[PDB]
């Protein structure tokens, strides 16, 4: 009835209670009970029809199923097993538990009465042949959940017949009429076994072999999942090629959910860890497919292929080739962390199996042999979870770099990189960029371990870092990495530990590095390290403050001496002289970024340098770019100090002259022919122009009104001109890594200008020359332009729309200069302009005034220029109308006719009487309204 | 006509199954490597429109200065 199906969806019951209640009904009347059961399977398909006693007695299953299809009386296409929500997932569980419990509770008597099982198998083996998906998905599930129950029964039977065989041979070896009864029990049990096989052979041949190849993947995944279960539970009987092959073929299925269940089902046969010989022969045939699935289009399947392959390492034979293992190793560098750590486990097991000395060396050789990544951040992240024993053994690493086969230069360089990221990921207890999921909060145990490790690192390397620096003081790569540890130290340990001696040693090593190395990144680390250590809230400030002031005193005095001769009017300096000037300028520039060097007043020093490059045109580019940076930092650090209302009044006005003349200086160098000089002037200008924008005042900072600076038309054009010449360039359609880095540079420059657009330092009309590049440069700059389009729409939608049409007006104008006025409206170029307009249209409450103004402008632009030869002949730009009709879809009903009266002021009636080709723009626009 | 879902094709031809066995190129892909250079790593965290439109073009390494720029956002 409704009752038996209802009982199962919200049972909150021991399904054994339902089964046992049913079995008792079966004993009182078999046919009444079976009819309840037949119907139960039919309502589990959402059927709503009822099988009657009459049907049960005289109708074949084929006829019943047909009658149930007609009487299905569905409200929709859904059926129980396709509903969403936990409550319905619980129904599926209840559905499967009832089937399994029912069989198992009957396994000792009822199941052999040649009536129940056969009747259910028949209905289910025919509902699984139905074109009605509901009847087929549901019956196929039930059939597999019945087979697995009958696999359990045959297993018990096999167990009990072995026990019976044991007692029989026991009685014979050592009373005769017991031997007779024991053999009649062995006869009975074989008769039982044959009946269970017959049943199983009819749910396999009648359902499986026909539904593992269903078209509904959810029905194919059901079948593969459960064959895996049979081979796992009754390995002796089902784990052979005759059953494995179905998983072997179906892992070529084109649906990921099905491929997944194949791997799962095979993982279960390997987690057994019974080292099966027949499974070993299957995996030789399908080894190559399984390895390839590590790069399955679905990452979830790829994780399981890797994990299956790690369990294959237990296999007695060497089944995987060298090639296979190296393809897995590469995946430690994958973007998807689930894949990377699965490969990490593979790497760990296969190759990892002080004491850890050679373990560390092997990791270094692996990293060097894997020519895919230059850093080890991702390598470390891949093995944080498994090899945490090794990656945090800093005593072993520090000793490998000092205490005497040896380590090569490349190996010491890689060991420093590896060690650096292990320290990074331990201090900042989170993964590298691209491997994390939104920085989830840490366990109490995790936070403890963050503490435990940070003291270990600080204790050790506060002593050892001075030693490493001294040994590798000459290798840039090595020192650039080493100088970044301080940012993770625990500042209070430097005092509690009586370590002031090592800090002095460190500070001296840094100074000798500053004096010798010029690598822009070596010097960046030195400056950021000093900034990290110059925290006024820790006990070591005045110590590091003293060494810092000593360092700048040397550099500033040397800088004066150098400039007094470099700029002496007759001492035409050569390359050697220039490199000396550049080496000190770089050091001053790096430190002036992170540190307040206002006291040394370097503003005039660089001004004389820059104006000389203007007058003579002879100045090395590296000198110019770093003088540009240092001046930028000089100005900003003053702007930071003048915040104080308790401040000198002359200084603030003095600054306006420091900034105003700097803008014209940069504007001059923006026209220079050297590219890196242009880029540098452009970036500093876009930053300066934002820092000094009107928004400098908002947060109660009304003092700074005199500092506001607004650019000229000349400057705005020069800035835009740079974007056109350096950003929107010919495109292809030194290989990837470099070409990505080049793109990111151009994106920075593009974002720099767009910041000025969405913040109204420049007229919004400038954005037209950008907005017209949306589709042409979608992949490269699409996201930046869309953000500019969104921010501008929020500020000024009518001005946004006015600039959008201007973009299309310019695209139109470009085409007439290239193709000609008599262009083809079917051209691919004209096609793209109006599709660009169609996307523009979806960016449209106050949308009424904007779309209206857009048509007013687009109309003027169409009729702006008249024809040379004829008023009855067409205006020149009239074809623009068909572009503008891409917008009318968005227009309101009310203003469509108002726009027409406006259009009639422009169009004479002879024109509106025109229908010829050239005027097909008109009627197309007329059809719009 | 009926909302009841009826499938015209139940099984998948043996011929289509042998094709799946012989060509799985459409269900495997290339390694999507993670930033392979320290600079590309840095460009991922500072990349993206959100970070790009809220941070200076010329990096400022002291937050005493970086503020001076973020002050001026809306």
């Amino acid at each position: 009835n409704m009752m038996l199906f209802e009982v199962v969806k919200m049972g909150k019951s021991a399904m054994q209670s339902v089964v046992d209640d049913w079995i008792e009904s079966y004993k009182h009347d078999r046919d009444i009970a079976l009819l309840d059961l037949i119907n139960f399977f039919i309502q589990c398909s959402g059927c709503k029809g009822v099988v009657t006693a009459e049907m049960f007695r005289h109708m074949q299953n084929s006829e019943i199923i047909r009658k149930m299809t007609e009487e299905f009386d569905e409200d929709s296409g859904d059926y129980p097993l396709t509903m969403a929500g936990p409550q319905w997932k619980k129904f599926k569980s209840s559905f499967c538990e009832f089937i399994g419990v029912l069989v198992r509770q009957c396994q000792y008597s009822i199941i052999y009465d040649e009536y129940m099982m056969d009747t259910v198998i028949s209905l289910l083996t025919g509902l699984s042949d139905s074109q009605v998906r509901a009847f087929r998905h549901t019956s196929t599930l039930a059939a597999m959940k019945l087979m697995t129950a009958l696999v359990n029964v045959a297993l018990n039977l096999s167990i009990n017949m072995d026990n019976t065989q044991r007692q029989y041979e026991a009685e014979r070896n050592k009373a005769n009429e017991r031997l007779e009864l024991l053999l009649q029990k062995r006869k009975e049990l074989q008769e039982n076994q044959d009946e269970i096989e017959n049943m199983m052979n009819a749910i396999f041949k009648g359902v499986f072999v026909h539904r593992y190849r269903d078209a509904i993947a959810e029905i194919r995944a059901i079948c593969i999942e459960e064959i895996g279960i049979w081979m796992k539970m009754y390995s002796d009987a089902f784990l052979n090629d005759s059953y494995l092959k179905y998983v072997g073929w179906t892992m070529h299925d084109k649906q990921g959910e099905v491929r997944l269940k194949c791997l799962t089902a095979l993982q279960g046969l390997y987690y057994n860890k019974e080292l099966n010989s027949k499974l070993e022969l299957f995996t030789s045939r399908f080894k190559d497919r399984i390895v390839s699935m590590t790069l399955d289009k679905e990452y979830d399947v790829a994780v399981q292929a890797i994990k299956l392959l790690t369990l294959v390492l237990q296999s007695s034979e060497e089944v995987l080739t060298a090639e296979d293992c190296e393809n897995v190793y590469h995946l430690v560098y994958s973007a998807h962390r689930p894949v990377a750590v699965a490969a990490g486990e593979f790497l760990y097991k296969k190759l990892f199996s002080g004491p850890n000395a050679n373990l560390v060396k092997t990791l270094v050789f692996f990293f060097l042999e894997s020519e895919l990544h230059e850093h080890a951040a991702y390598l470390v992240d891949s093995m944080w979870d498994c090899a945490t024993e090794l990656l945090k053994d800093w005593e072993c690493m520090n000793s490998l770099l000092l205490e005497e086969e040896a380590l090569t230069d490349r190996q010491e360089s890689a060991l420093i990189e590896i060690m650096l990221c292990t320290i990074r990921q331990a201090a900042e207890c989170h993964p590298p960029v691209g491997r994390g999921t939104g920085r989830k909060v840490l366990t109490a145990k995790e936070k403890k371990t963050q503490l435990d490790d940070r003291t270990k690192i600080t204790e050790l390397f506060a002593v050892a870092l001075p030693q490493l620096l001294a040994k590798y003081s000459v290798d840039a790569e090595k020192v650039t990495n080493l100088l970044q540890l301080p940012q993770y130290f625990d500042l209070e340990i430097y005092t509690t530990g009586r370590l002031e001696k090592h800090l002095d040693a460190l500070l001296r090593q840094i100074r000798n590095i500053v004096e010798k190395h010029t690598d822009t990144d070596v010097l960046e680390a030195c400056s950021k390290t000093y900034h990290a250590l110059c925290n006024e809230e820790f006990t070591i400030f005045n110590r590091v403050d003293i060494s810092r002031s000593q360092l700048i005193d040397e550099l500033a005095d040397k800088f004066n001496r150098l400039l007094e001769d470099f700029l002496q009017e007759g001492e035409e300096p050569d390359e050697d002289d220039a490199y000396q000037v550049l080496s000190t300028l770089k050091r001053i520039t790096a430190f002036h970024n992170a540190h307040d060097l206002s006291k040394w007043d370097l503003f005039a020093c660089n001004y004389k340098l820059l104006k000389t490059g203007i007058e003579n045109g002879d100045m090395p580019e590296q000198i110019v770019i770093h003088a540009l940076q240092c001046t930028h930092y000089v100005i900003l650090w003053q702007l930071a100090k003048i915040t104080e209302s308790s401040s000198t009044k002359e200084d603030l006005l003095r600054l306006k002259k420091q900034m105003r003349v700097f803008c014209q200086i940069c504007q001059h160098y923006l026209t220079n022919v050297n590219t890196t000089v242009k880029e540098q002037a452009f970036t500093i200008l876009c930053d300066i122009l934002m820092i000094f924008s009107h928004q400098i005042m908002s947060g109660g900072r009304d003092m700074l009104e005199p500092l506001v600076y607004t650019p000229d038309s000349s400057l705005q054009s020069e800035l835009l001109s740079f974007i056109l010449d350096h950003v929107f360039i010919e495109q292809d359609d030194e290989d990837e890594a470099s070409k990505i880095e080049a793109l990111h540079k151009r994106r920075n420059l593009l974002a720099a200008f767009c910041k000025l657009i969405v913040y109204t330092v420049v007229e919004m009309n400038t954005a037209a020359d950008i907005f017209k590049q949306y589709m042409k440069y979608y992949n490269d700059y699409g996201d930046i332009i869309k953000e500019t389009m969104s921010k501008t729409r929020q500020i000024d939608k009518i001005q946004c729309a006015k600039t959008l049409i201007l973009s299309l007006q310019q695209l139109f104008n470009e085409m007439i200069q290239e193709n000609g006025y008599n262009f083809d409206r079917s051209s691919s170029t004209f096609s793209g302009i109006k599709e660009l307009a169609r996307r523009f249209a979806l960016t449209f409450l106050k949308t009424r005034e904007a779309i209206a103004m857009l048509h007013k402008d687009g109309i003027e632009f169409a009729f702006k220029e008249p024809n040379p030869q004829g008023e009855s002949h067409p205006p020149l730009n009239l074809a623009f109308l068909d572009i503008l009709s891409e917008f009318s879809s968005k227009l309101l009903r009310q203003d469509k006719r108002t726009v027409y009266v406006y259009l009639e002021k422009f169009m004479t009636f002879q024109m509106s009487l025109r229908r010829e080709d050239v005027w097909l723009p008109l009627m197309s626009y007329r059809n719009s309204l | 006509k009926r909302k009841l879902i009826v499938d015209s094709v139940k099984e998948l031809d043996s011929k289509t199954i042998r094709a799946q066995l012989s060509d799985y190129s459409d269900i495997v892909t290339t390694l999507d490597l993670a930033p392979p250079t320290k600079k590309l790593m840095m460009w991922k965290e500072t990349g993206g429109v959100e970070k790009l439109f809220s941070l200076p073009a010329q990096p400022l390494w002291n937050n005493r200065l970086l503020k001076l720029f973020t002050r001026c956002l809306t």
């Binding site: 072999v209 090629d241 092959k245 073929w249 045939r285 | 043996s14 199954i17 042998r18």
Partner: peptide
């Protein structure tokens, strides 16, 4: 049996 898996002989 590697003739078992050969789907050219079907199931």
């Amino acid at each position: 049996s590697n003739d078992a898996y050969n789907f050219n002989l079907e199931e």
